[PDB]
């Protein structure tokens, strides 16, 4: 199935994740699934002259499990020794505060608008070397925030303070938020729901990501069978 997707979509497979509290890499660190997350990490970082310090994670459509992939990949980076930040850049339908069991009264949107401080907006989790910047309150104008000087300045600060930054984003099919964040990271990981029978959507997502000019590092195939 992996080889089918690699050829039909024309992208390398960074890893395939079987169907499977969300944080399997933390709760079951020796599991074969957790090892596949470590394989994704390794495939991103060892692919010579790439210096990847940050990535956008997006998907072809809603319901692909993208946010769970992003969170577990962040745990894998932290376990490998990277001081890691996961940013919930989906300010429309945020989920990282649910995944990590955190409040969402302060986060990305409030930080950018000066309603909360840097120090208050980023939370250190109970997992060593893993911090989370939740989305904050839902703004009426998310794309304006992403393209603001405020975000450009924040991004520079994050690169000073973290060895690796992962930005979860909305799916790429209807809004351009993922593309706008890709200006900053220069790098995108594409989560594809293997259960999605609409291959036009899968192919279109690749096209949309490539149109940014960012490096499409490869695909994470999710919800694979045993």
Author numbering: 201 to 220, 1009 to 1035, 1037 to 1215
Provide passages from the article that reported this PDB entry.
A new family of protein tyrosine-kinases harboring a P-loop type nucleotide binding-domain with a Walker A motif has been described. They have been called BY-kinases (Bacterial-tyrosine-kinases) as they are only found in bacterial genomes. BY-kinase autophosphorylation on a C-terminal tyrosine cluster, called Y-cluster is crucial in regulating polysaccharide export. In firmicutes, the situation is quite similar except that BY-kinases are split into two proteins: one corresponds to the cytoplasmic catalytic domain of proteobacterial BY-kinases (about 230 residues) and the other is a transmembrane domain homologous to the Wzz-like domain (about 230 residues) of proteobacterial BY-kinases.
In order to find out the structural basis of this discrepancy, we solved the crystal structure of the chimera CapA2B2 (last 27 C-terminal amino acids of CapA2 fused to the N-terminus of CapB2). Previous mass spectrometry analysis demonstrated indeed that each band corresponds to a different phosphorylation level, from 0 to 4 phosphorylated residues among the 4 tyrosines 221, 222, 224 and 225 of the Y-cluster. This result demonstrated that the Y-cluster of the CapA2B2 chimera from S. aureus autophosphorylated spontaneously during its production process in E. coli cells. Autophosphorylation was however less efficient than for CapA1B2 since addition of ATP was required to observe the fully phosphorylated form of CapA2B2. As previously observed in the CapA1B2/ADP-Mg complex, the phosphorylated C-terminal Y-cluster of CapB2 is disordered and analysis of the crystal contacts using PISA confirmed that the protein is a monomer. The CapA2 N-terminal part of the protein adopts the same αA-βA conformation than that of the CapA1 fragment. Interestingly, CapB2 residues 1 to 8 linking βA to helix α1 are disordered. Unlike the CapA1B2(K55M) structure that contained bound ADP-Mg while no nucleotide was added to the crystallization solution, the active site of CapA2B2 did not reveal any electron density corresponding to a nucleotide that would have co-purified from E. coli. This is in agreement with a previous study showing that CapA2B2 displays a weaker affinity for nucleotides compared to CapA1B2, with respective Kd values for Mant-ATP of 190 nM and 50 nM. In the apo structure of CapA2B2, Phe220 is slightly shifted compared to the CapA1 Phe221 residue stacked against the bound adenine in the CapA1B2/ADP-Mg complex. The reduced activation efficiency of CapA2 could be explained by the absence of the CapA1 last residue Asn222 that interacts with the N-terminus of CapB2.
